[PDB]
Design a protein around this ligand. Sequence first.
Ligand SMILES: CCC(=O)NCC[C@@H]1CCc2ccc3c(c21)CCO3
Ligand SMILES: [Zn+2]
Length: 448
Amino acid sequence: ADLEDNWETLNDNLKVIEKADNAAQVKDALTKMRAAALDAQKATPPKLEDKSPDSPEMKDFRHGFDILVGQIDDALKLANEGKVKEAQAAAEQLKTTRNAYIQKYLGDGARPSWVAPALSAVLIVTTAVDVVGNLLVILSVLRNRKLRNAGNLFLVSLALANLVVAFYPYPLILVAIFYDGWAFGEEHCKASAFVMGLSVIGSVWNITAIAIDRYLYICHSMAYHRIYRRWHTPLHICLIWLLTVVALLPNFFVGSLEYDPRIYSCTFIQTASTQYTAAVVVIHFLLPIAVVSFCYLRIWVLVLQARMKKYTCTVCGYIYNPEDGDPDNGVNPGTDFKDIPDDWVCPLCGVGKDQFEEVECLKPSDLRSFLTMFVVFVIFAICFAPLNCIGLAVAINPQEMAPQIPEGLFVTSYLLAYFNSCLNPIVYGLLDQNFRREYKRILLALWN
Ligand SMILES: CCC(=O)NCC[C@@H]1CCc2ccc3c(c21)CCO3
Ligand SMILES: [Zn+2]
């Protein structure tokens, strides 16, 4: 057997020990991994093919292999006794000495020169804008009480999902570019991928929970106020985050959280299990996009039919807001002007509905800022649409569609997925006039 085929063999049996149940399954995997380690030792590397068999370049690899074999001897003594958790720890210790020592004259490192300066620039820009912008969102919602109670408590949850990915995984990815390879341990590798999982899936379900809250506030607005919202929304934020952790646990069993050299980041692997990836593309993308697309379609048909809209008085300038109503004149909050009985008159000048003109302009701050949150969703869809397509193609047939996907296309798609983390406060400033004022309020306070 060739050295290239043996490099895969002992690496494939190492993944078996991680998903093993008893010590006999570990002992059977350690026997195959030791025979492959002896075989790869009695083979010249393709990279150092020019280097002589006695010369000091190939002589260091021959002495380096015996260090890894002795580590299997220490691991098999634990496996004979019946220790699985102790032998799995010894297997991870041999895995670190198999990518640092053994991977010297081995590797298909044919990555184009543009992936390193782009990824890193995107990563610097994203991490810098995220830690500042999303922090200002947290600050503006915690300060402004009128904005917080306007269903923007979910924004704290979404901004924390965006922030957490900039503090732990993004900087480690940047170190993995400059040092060329994952410079941190396997425990730091699996965790970085998991943190990114919470940030991605958590953002999907936070956007959907917002689409439901903004669907119920415009459509079935009467029913909305009848149902409590005091303690309901902090409970929903807790539930959607626990659902995310539950959805991320099968990664620990399948073993899909490993280092990807293509994008220099320790992330989720699409080829590990085509059954679990299919569930991530459908249940955690295709389905939640479909329920949100319906939510905003029902809102847009109301705006198009000129339904829930502000009506201003052509006598004393009284602006009737459907979100406010007219409670002292019987109009309970959340009532459309087209539904108020014809006997109703202005509660300021007493002129009838006859002389009432609507605002033929929808502002992005109106109806709990429905337009901004819509833009937020469309932006999210754009960033994660190609990556979910790659994961969909591999799930169908990985035997022919996995090598068919270009390496350049994967980096281009993963660059967008990362960049989404800093884009959310940018759209709050440009579209939401109330957030814009609050951004200036905090920035002027930090100055003076
Ligand atoms: C289409 C499949 C895909 O590429 N999905 C996004 C990869 C994201 C981001 C990192 C991470 C970690 C764990 C995890 C997931 C991800 C999906 C479910 O478990
Ligand atoms: Zn009036």
